[PDB]
Amino acid sequence: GRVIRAQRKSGGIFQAHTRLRKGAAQLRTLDFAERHGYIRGVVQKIIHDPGRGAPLAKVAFRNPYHYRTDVETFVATEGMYTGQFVYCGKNAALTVGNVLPVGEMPEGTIISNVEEKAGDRGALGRSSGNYVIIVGHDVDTGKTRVKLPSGAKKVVPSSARGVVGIVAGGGRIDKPLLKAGRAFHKYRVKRNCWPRTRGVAMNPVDHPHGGGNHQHVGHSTTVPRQSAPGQKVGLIAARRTGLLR
Amino acid sequence: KILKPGKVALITRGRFAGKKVVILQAIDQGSKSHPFGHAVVAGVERYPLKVTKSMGAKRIARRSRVKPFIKVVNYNHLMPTRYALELDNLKGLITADTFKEPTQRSAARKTVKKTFEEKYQSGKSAWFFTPLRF
Amino acid sequence: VRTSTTFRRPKTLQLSRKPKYARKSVAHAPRLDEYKIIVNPINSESAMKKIEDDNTLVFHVHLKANKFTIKEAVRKLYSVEPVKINTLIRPNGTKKAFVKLSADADALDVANRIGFL
């Protein structure tokens, strides 16, 4: 009878808390220097970005056209240290931290912050400890096949770039949170998504799951992909439920 | 022995940090007033300005004027280089007394200036006279 | 030949207003002059004591008079040089000014000459 908590997630009090953010983590804009050669930057500082599991690197590059210094916020890779030189471009060496086009890197290399399409400045393999693996090349069509952290294989333009190495901060989810307070603090610096009340504990007006004299769903929890926004709760378009016993 | 008279070195500490100097005399054994291995040097404080073929003679002289300085510097504060400067006319002018009486220090500064002026005009030691950017 | 990727709009000649007539037939007389600044002196017991002690006159002053216009109005109306002006808006919504006169003049004679004692 009322719109459900899922439907109210359109904005308002569910926005991301971005007061303490240390910059948007992006690659350099694909310019002439980075397309035909390489450009060197210095890692000024590695910092913690609240709401993010991976540390950020403040790499300072020289502007190739004007007398000033450009500072780029990168997703730090393991091994990055202050004062390390980072080379970005086609002729960059295959060293951890460098940025190269995926077409210039051999099969089986470990890369992160990969561009989906050359020029979007990083899309794939950015969470802490995640990476993308170069599976193969197709020179004739100028494409590169990569393996994503989810295991899905994707075809990307051979000019897409990616930072060599794995993202720093790996193993973050390996340690249990141990208490609701740690979950409380972890999610302050993120959106308003915690704590999560179950729909069975609500009323028929509050949720499709709510109601009854017992806490039961009352209907199959796998809903069609075509269901209305208010109906789309539970397991949406589930192809297979249950454990793999 | 790499700190010898006539060797170009860099001052790394003091007011004249990063200035190129020539080893005028080495007292590495030490002294009563300086118990360390010091070496008296003569260098440039105000490097001559860059000159252009389009410039007139008055400005060419005006920019080519160079302001020298004489200083006794510790070995640890000196950075020796491979470059060597031929210190003609500049062999015997510095002594402990030359520092004690500033009138000899003032005379030494003037002689060092006129030697640096002539050497700059002669076009020798281009690296010595160009400022070091850091 | 352009060495900058941006196109900034060019500067054009901006003629100044040269009207064919005046929008107002006659300019208004100064609407806040000396006589409208000073309404009347205050002659309460506290005002009298300020006269005899601090060499300070107390005036009922127009709301939109600042310390500068009060000083000139007093100088023009009374030919006395004030050394300080302190103003307050009384709880009834009227400005009151404490005009401290110079050491060369006394507020007593100024008060008698005005005639409000």
Binding site: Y38, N63, Y67 | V51 | R2, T5, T6
Partner: peptide, 30 residues
């Protein structure tokens, strides 16, 4: 020939000295 007139050539390669002012007419946001 004044010896003080020394040549200071600028390399304009990638990562070298700042790029000189060139004709960017075809890239102007008109």
């Amino acid at each position: 020939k004044n010896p003080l007139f020394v040549s200071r050539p600028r390399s304009f390669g990638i990562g070298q000295d700042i790029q000189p002012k060139r004709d960017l007419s075809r890239f102007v946001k008109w």
